[PDB]
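Morning!

As promised:
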Amino acid sequence: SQLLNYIDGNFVTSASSFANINPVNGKLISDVFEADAKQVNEAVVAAQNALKGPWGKLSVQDRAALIHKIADGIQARFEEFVAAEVADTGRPVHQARTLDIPRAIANFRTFADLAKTSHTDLFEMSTSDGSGALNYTVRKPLGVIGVISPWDLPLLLFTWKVAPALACGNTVVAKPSEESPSSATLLAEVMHDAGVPPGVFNLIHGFGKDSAGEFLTQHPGISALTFTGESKTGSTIMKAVADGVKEVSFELGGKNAAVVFADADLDAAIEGVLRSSFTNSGQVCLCSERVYVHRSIFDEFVSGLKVEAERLVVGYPDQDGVNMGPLISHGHRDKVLSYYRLAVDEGATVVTGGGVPKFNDERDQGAYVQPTIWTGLSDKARCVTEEIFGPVCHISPFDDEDEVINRVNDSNYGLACAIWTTNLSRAHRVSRQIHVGLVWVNTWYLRDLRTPFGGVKLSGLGREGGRFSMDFYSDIANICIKI
Amino acid sequence: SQLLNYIDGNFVTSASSFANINPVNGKLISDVFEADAKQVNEAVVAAQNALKGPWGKLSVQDRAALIHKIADGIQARFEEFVAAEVADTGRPVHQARTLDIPRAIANFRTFADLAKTSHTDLFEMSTSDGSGALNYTVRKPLGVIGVISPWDLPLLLFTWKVAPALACGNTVVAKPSEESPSSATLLAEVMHDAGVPPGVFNLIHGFGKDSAGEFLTQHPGISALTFTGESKTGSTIMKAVADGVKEVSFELGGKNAAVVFADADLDAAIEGVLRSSFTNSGQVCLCSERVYVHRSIFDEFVSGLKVEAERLVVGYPDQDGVNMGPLISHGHRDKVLSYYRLAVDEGATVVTGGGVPKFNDERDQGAYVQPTIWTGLSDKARCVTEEIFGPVCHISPFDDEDEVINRVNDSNYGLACAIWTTNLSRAHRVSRQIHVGLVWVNTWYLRDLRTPFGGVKLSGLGREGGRFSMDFYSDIANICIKI
Amino acid sequence: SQLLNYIDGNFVTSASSFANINPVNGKLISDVFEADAKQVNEAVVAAQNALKGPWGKLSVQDRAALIHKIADGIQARFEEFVAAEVADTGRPVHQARTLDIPRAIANFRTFADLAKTSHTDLFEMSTSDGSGALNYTVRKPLGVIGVISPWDLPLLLFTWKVAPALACGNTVVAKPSEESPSSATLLAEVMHDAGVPPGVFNLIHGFGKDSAGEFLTQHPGISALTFTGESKTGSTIMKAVADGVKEVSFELGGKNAAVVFADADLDAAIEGVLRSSFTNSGQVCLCSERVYVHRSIFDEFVSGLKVEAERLVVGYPDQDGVNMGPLISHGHRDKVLSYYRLAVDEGATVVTGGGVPKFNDERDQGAYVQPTIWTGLSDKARCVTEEIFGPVCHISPFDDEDEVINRVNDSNYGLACAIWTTNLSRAHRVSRQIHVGLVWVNTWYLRDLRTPFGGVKLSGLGREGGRFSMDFYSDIANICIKI
Amino acid sequence: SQLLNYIDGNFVTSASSFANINPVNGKLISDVFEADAKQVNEAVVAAQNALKGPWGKLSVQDRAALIHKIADGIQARFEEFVAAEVADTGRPVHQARTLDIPRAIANFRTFADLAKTSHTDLFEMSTSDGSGALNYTVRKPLGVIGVISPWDLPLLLFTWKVAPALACGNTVVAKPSEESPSSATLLAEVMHDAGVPPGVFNLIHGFGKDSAGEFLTQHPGISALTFTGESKTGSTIMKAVADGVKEVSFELGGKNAAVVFADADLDAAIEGVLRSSFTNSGQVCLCSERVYVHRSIFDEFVSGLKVEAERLVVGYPDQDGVNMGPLISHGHRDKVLSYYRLAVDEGATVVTGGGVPKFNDERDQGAYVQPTIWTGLSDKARCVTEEIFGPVCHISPFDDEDEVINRVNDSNYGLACAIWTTNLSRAHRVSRQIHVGLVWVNTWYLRDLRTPFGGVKLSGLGREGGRFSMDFYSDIANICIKI
Ligand SMILES: O=C(O)C(=O)/C=C/C=C/O
Ligand SMILES: O=C(O)C(=O)/C=C/C=C/O
Ligand SMILES: O=C(O)C(=O)/C=C/C=C/O
Ligand SMILES: O=C(O)C(=O)/C=C/C=C/O
Ligand code: NA
Ligand code: NA
Ligand code: NA
Ligand code: NA
């Protein structure tokens, strides 16, 4: 019923609190204490000091063991974490159990393992006097990492940033989304119980503008800011940290495409586009909101998708056979519904959905919408260019390989793309021409945590994952010995 | 007498021009045509288009071979490049012959080779269905790289950015310092004569605010901005590209320290600090302006360094035995002299220098100052904390190793540091505790081009050099094949 | 014409000599002096002393520049090298001009570049006393490398070993095949004229047993033995160096398969198999001598291949549209023909060829055979299991993917395989299951010099190419500093 | 007690057994069943078959998880492993507790982690038709690994080979020293209880010639032979596998030097050399048996070492304050004593030791010798050049740096060297000149498991540890896709 901040080893309240609302039924889950500027400073100062403490003296093997203990602590409370994620967001219990929570445990274990095996470089060189010199690099913590995370995959994305930060020996001040504060608070309890030293991990609650989020980005004591969320928010943050020339790592919006070629396994493609459009009710940065299907199979694709989409069970997270929960909030539902209207006004054909389901129970006070498919829009329509972040896709026919490549690339975004084809040459030839961070062939959101992850253009800045995270969360320093 | 812009394969003039003045004698060298917003736009569009032309079709081996040809063409005009860099900046001819021009040639060769040898990653994974998946990464050009370079090592820093940009298959719009435009204009001729396709390399002349530099940073058509220069300028550029979320790479100011331990080779450390403080008349980001010397050798060090500083020949670039030329400009001299006055005001002892030499010839119309040594200032003094960028160092005693490490690190900058000690443990123990991008032990500015190069805190953002350059100037894309 | 040994900077003759015979017409090309044991010792001692000369003092940059001069020297005498390869082996002039000689040049250039860019490792560790330690590795020359090469790709395979050896700072004693000693002798001239210091590169001529090859392998002065050739010879050499526990690197025989799946591009597959079976008259270790074609397209494949094999031009190296020259020698032809008879005895159907062409000119005194195709042999037949090393292939149908994988792997060899398929999944799924060093999909013998190259089982020992050559030809040494 | 073989998941007896003798007192510990040729074959065939079973189907994550369970199993029986190691070897309990057993556990954990994190390479290339090609590598099990280990660090060295072998997906047939079979037998129990599939790990007991060791090396079913032990045995083994061209990896003898410069911390160097000479009663391949001390400190060094050596407590493994236990066996003691006499015969001064201690108890029936120090021998003396493998060192003075470097390098061996100096330049300058696999500066036998580990010359063949192990125990295969 109440969620506290976690600062310098202590759970602490605040002068103000805000409502945490279950989107299944509009009911109050808890009140959340909002950290103010003083508390943010206190968090950052504590993190700075923690760097000079026992955390700073741990060997890499011991730090890694301790991180493995955080992962163990989450596993030990697995079902509590599931319930926490579910309550905040309305996501299906099965998704929380298979995707959200196990990925958070894996995030810690993977970066603990990387931290342990990573090494640096030795460069030998000749000099004028014939004695030579040695250059070697070492890996130091960057310092205090400020973490700001979104609500689509709360624990997953939170720990995606927090785990490599800690693995590289940094200290952390982390601000989860106001819409999904619960699993982050549980994680803070796991950290405390695991004996993570005071000040190493700090959790602050609040909003962005004129709240904890902004105060973090403005604090001169942080060394870097890592952020996942809206593109325009990324621009704001970059401006905020600019005077301290802080390092930044961004994963921002997309308007991602799926492309189905005539030679695709059609049933697999229909199935694939279904999950890529409607997973988490379409509320993943990685979702496909534009779909291009070859003309010769377009009608059969749209027909098959319509059928599968209409079979999707929209209901309670714990309901048998449920496929979709609600949107995160009423405010977000208002945005999505305003796009549903905008699509009609723009001339779209509503193949399916386009409204909100009727339950005749508590769920009518929730924030549900229906899975929606449009056709008939131009490539320039706002509904096909702007990110909606709802369970929706527009499907469009295409004819030629180069044509569709140009159409996928005709965007200010470039996060990810999914391609369906059985042809060897086409798969590799087309993939390399798509201007995004991630291309999937005959699948979607399939993740190896070692790979580079991120987007080009407005979709991001930098890369994370594997060695790219080890690079960002570390200060690589060069030492030259004249011999 | 005239320096043109180079846009889309053609040398073009402009409506306005500005003076290029020789700092040795205050005389006019050339008129430089200033690119306006329209010309900057034309350069960017031409760069965008060149990406889809012949340049985009070259194999990695053919691109590398052409970049080697650029290097060859500089080499074939070696003495012209020397005379250009000298005329603009007043640097001694011997420095231009040994440092500036050869490093510019070596920059191209190094990144050409790196481009031929670099590869990417293959990740194998298991899937639920037991068929598995492949993730592989590919290296693509990022796009159009905006380059803005400073006047301290004009061609070296210009090519430091341009070489890896081209080696990675990018196209370039580059704006060199208004104080040192000549060698860059010469490079454009080499580019043209070598057969670099139109639009691949574009040179725009001008200033920062309300001029070519600002127009470049604000153009939506660039994919990245790499910049070396003032720290506050870095902040301005970060703000300016934030709306487009552009990749940025910064090498900024420094207030670098040298530390001389009791067990140093004293005569070598004196000579070392002389070189680190007064090379290029102290106008390098890497120069030492703070010097800490063990108490037991402090008086001897200061006396030794005074004698050597007064031996330095300050004069014409090709004068016999010359060690120091003038500062870059009268405006920069006004800044430096302003700090010379501030130091006396803050209670400094002037061990030597402190003013301007009197030549009683045309050099009196140039921008010379004396090499200057201060003692007696507090660690809080402005002259000890703010980057001056002239031929000066303050020398302070220390007693204790941990004390001196704290005093070195007590700075909003962290670019480089030089340490003098003959003790094995001390060299490695102390070095790793210095919070800077580069440490030298028993030398200074010894460069291996494969090392990471950059600074921490206000001194930089990101790293370049070796694979760090190959990452920044590349778009690293992940492709996932479900099998 | 005469071919001398090259020892300690000098061309020298020997007590004994043998004939170099043109396989096109059986005429004498030159006399070759056979090095005795005394001269082999002299070469090895010279190479040992060369490690302590000026060669050992060169910077990696300077050594790389010199290697680039060797490559320049071959390029400057390109057609002389083409002429020499062709004379010894009868290979088409077009193959020599496009494959053989350019690869030899690219071998030197690639490893010189690799030597310039390559670095080693830095490992930090904690210690009980809390002060830590550093482990760093350095790359040293291994010492004297013994090189023994075969006659199939004479200069290519010779420089494939010699180039990385020199690039890693080693010295070399090299014994080319008695059947192809010309191009290597010319290479010795290039080395001498490029100013390669005396003893760095030594060339000895002769045979295996009781001759230069054996003497080299028995000499205690070498640090490693690298070898390409027959599998049994590999075993003999391994025994010979065992008393000195010398490092060895072997690329040995193969009985390589090609697999054509039903979804293949049939015309391309036919042309591909033609190439992989008959290139260099089937005298490449990488050639396919067993072919598996899906039952549904088997007859059509065999018909198509027969027609193409019959259009092949067998004749003079510079003859218009020539596809195949002779075999290396009459003795080799004796072996290949004996297998032609054996195949008939084992009950093979001779689809085409199976004899020797009748020229009615000087070529009838050469060592030509016809390109040959067989069907109807069981998987256990000697001709399907033993390496023939001539222009021949057996074709057999298959039904099942798992079945054909098993049949390809049912072999004591494991060098290479080519598979033909347009299916994305199939290419990757099948390729990873083939127990060979190298798989090609929809091509054959397409080389990127950075990749690992070698065979499993009886087909080799170790890998070369890229970092694997850099590792084999270097002493990687670990240095640990306790801090 | 009895020690059985472990073949295809079953503990089995043999036709013959041999005695396992406690070297502290000469009493019988157990009878050990000696595997015959038939049982060796059964073990190899079972290892082959296990590759095609459930073991072959584990994901890299699952295989790693299971290898961690093996480590967990050892940890759970920690004191039993200690007792087994101690009983077989007479090693001090505190050594087994801190070095031997924890390293066996760490071997498994380190390679499990490396297997989880390791990835391979992607190479892009251009082709004539302008479509390009992809080369990528994959990591496969080599096959069946034959492991032969020595008695000096039984479980440590046994798991040093077995852990990476299993981590890379191989199956194992492993033969421990007849002198120390107990801990390896306990390990098979741990494997069994952890649910390692039958045939994945096989333990065969026995001798070398005409026994399990020989039979394993000559078996055509193994893919590789990894071996630590005597040099001459390495030669024997290299010959035995030659007919199969098996991959081999050797860590062989040494005659290692320590060098103490005048500027060393003398006290630390005396303690360091005491540890390097007498650890495990001088029975480690890495022990120093030759010591060079600068003449200015020679007498003080030798006097101090004499004092510390005489303070060494030689006795029972669980004796209070024990430093040294017995040698491994009476047979080994006879060898070491023959060297003690030989030293006297070539004119040595015995500074201390030189015989066997008189205990007047059951230990007199064991295999004890005294820690021994010689001076007065020339560099050509057999006792200064041949590996003794007992608790002994000769100390010689030196004058010049280049002199002592030549004397260290004047050896058919080159495993390791330790150097004592406080001078920064000297440390790096001298270290890189010692022709061995491992140099320690101001320490000895400090191990980072990521570093390359092995010797040059007669001391080894190949490298293990880190990526070097990952390379040797893996088949790295290239796949080339033409696009
Ligand atoms: O899977 C990840 O590591 C990740 O960061 C996903 C981002 C999705 C945001 O909506
Ligand atoms: O040496 C370099 O590569 C470099 O970038 C030097 C920067 C110095 C700025 O004053
Ligand atoms: O292409 C290569 O580098 C190579 O080694 C070719 C081997 C062919 C042997 O017949
Ligand atoms: O510490 C190791 O990994 C190792 O292999 C030690 C070898 C010592 C043999 O006597
Ligand atoms: Na909520
Ligand atoms: Na100027
Ligand atoms: Na010949
Ligand atoms: Na025993």
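The CA atoms of residues 126 and 132 of chain B lie 4 Å apart.

Hope this helps with the figure draft.
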